[PDB]
Amino acid sequence: GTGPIFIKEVSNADISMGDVATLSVTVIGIPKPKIQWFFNGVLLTPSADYKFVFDGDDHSLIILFTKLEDEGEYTCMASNDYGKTICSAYLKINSKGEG
C-alpha cells in the first residue's frame, strides 16, 4: 500500500501547430492510482480531440489537431488512498498566422 510514484514523468515537447501532441507517464502504487490531466491548472475531460489512454502502468494524453491556444503547462496528477503526486511539462506549439 504505497502512494503513487511516477516511474516516468511527463517531458516538455515542441510541436508545430496542427500536429498531434502527446504527453506520457508511467505510474505505480497500490491501490492502482487514478490519473487526471490539467491545463494551466484546469482539469481536462475526454472529448473528440483529447484522448486519455492507458496500457498497463502507462498513461498518455493525446491532443489531436493542435492550435496555438493549446500551448501551455500540462500537469499529470496521480491519486490513490495513500497520496497524490504530480508532474508537469510545457507544451510549446510553434504556429504561423496573421493578426
From Swiss-Prot:
Subcellular location as annotated: Cytoplasm; Nucleus
Ig-like domain residues: 4-87
Maturation and modification: Autophosphorylated.
Tissue expression as described in the entry: Isoforms 3, 7 and 8 are expressed in cardiac muscle. Isoform 4 is expressed in vertebrate skeletal muscle. Isoform 6 is expressed in skeletal muscle (at protein level).
SUBUNIT field: Interacts with MYOM1, MYOM2, tropomyosin and myosin. Interacts with actin, primarily via the PEVK domains and with MYPN. Interacts with FHL2, NEB, CRYAB, LMNA/lamin-A and LMNB/lamin-B. Interacts with TCAP/telethonin and/or ANK1 isoform Mu17/ank1.5, via the first two N-terminal immunoglobulin domains. Interacts with TRIM63 and TRIM55, through several domains including immunoglobulin domains 141 and 142. Interacts with ANKRD1, ANKRD2 and ANKRD23, via the region between immunoglobulin domains 77 and 78 and interacts with CAPN3, via immunoglobulin domain 79.
Family: Belongs to the protein kinase superfamily. CAMK Ser/Thr protein kinase family.
Note: In some isoforms, after the PEVK repeat region there is a long PEVK duplicated region. On account of this region, it has been very difficult to sequence the whole protein. The length of this region (ranging from 183 to 2174 residues), may be a key elastic element of titin.
Disease / disorder: Myopathy, myofibrillar, 9, with early respiratory failure: An autosomal dominant myopathy characterized by adulthood onset of weakness in proximal, distal, axial and respiratory muscles. Pelvic girdle weakness, foot drop and neck weakness are the main symptoms at onset, but ultimately the weakness usually involves the proximal compartment of both upper and lower limbs. Additional features include variable degrees of Achilles tendon contractures, spinal rigidity and muscle hypertrophy. Respiratory involvement often leads to requirement for non-invasive ventilation support.
Function of the molecule: Key component in the assembly and functioning of vertebrate striated muscles. By providing connections at the level of individual microfilaments, it contributes to the fine balance of forces between the two halves of the sarcomere. The size and extensibility of the cross-links are the main determinants of sarcomere extensibility properties of muscle. In non-muscle cells, seems to play a role in chromosome condensation and chromosome segregation during mitosis. Might link the lamina network to chromatin or nuclear actin, or both during interphase.
Domain-related comment: ZIS1 and ZIS5 regions contain multiple SPXR consensus sites for ERK- and CDK-like protein kinases as well as multiple SP motifs. ZIS1 could adopt a closed conformation which would block the TCAP-binding site.
Protein name in UniProt: Titin
Annotated source species: Homo sapiens (Human)
Full protein stretch here: 3500 to 3598 of 34350
